[PDB]
Amino acid sequence: DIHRKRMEKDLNELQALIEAHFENRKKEEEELVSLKDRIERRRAERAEQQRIRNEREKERQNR
Amino acid sequence: SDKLKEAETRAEFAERSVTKLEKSIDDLEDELYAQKLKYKAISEELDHALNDMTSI
Numbered sequence: 001d002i003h004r005k006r007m008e009k010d011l012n013e014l015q016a017l018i019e020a021h022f023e024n025r026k027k028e029e030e031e032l033v034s035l036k037d038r039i040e041r042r043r044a045e046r047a048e049q050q051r052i053r054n055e056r057e058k059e060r061q062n063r
Numbered sequence: 064s065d066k067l068k069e070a071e072t073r074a075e076f077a078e079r080s081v082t083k084l085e086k087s088i089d090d091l092e093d094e095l096y097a098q099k100l101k102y103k104a105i106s107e108e109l110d111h112a113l114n115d116m117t118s119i
Binding site: 052056059063 | 069070073076077080
């Protein structure tokens, strides 16, 4: 009886397997979207720092 | 005195830039290290599964 009860709980864990998958999949999708927005963030940051270094150069010759 | 003031202004600008870039580097550094920690974890675990293939 304890063994049959044990068998059923394993079955519970078995289907739970997919439930363990869900949190990992949401975390994966969060990493997805964060990296995708980091793409344009990096590009805009590169443009901004190029402008900043341009201002640095003009102030350099200005002194 | 005027020239000294202009040069001091430019130097302070540059130094604040230094500090801000250092902080940005810090944040990026921590994120990259954590990324590689979890990368090596998932790689080792894929290898462990392959070890499972060997046990089978």
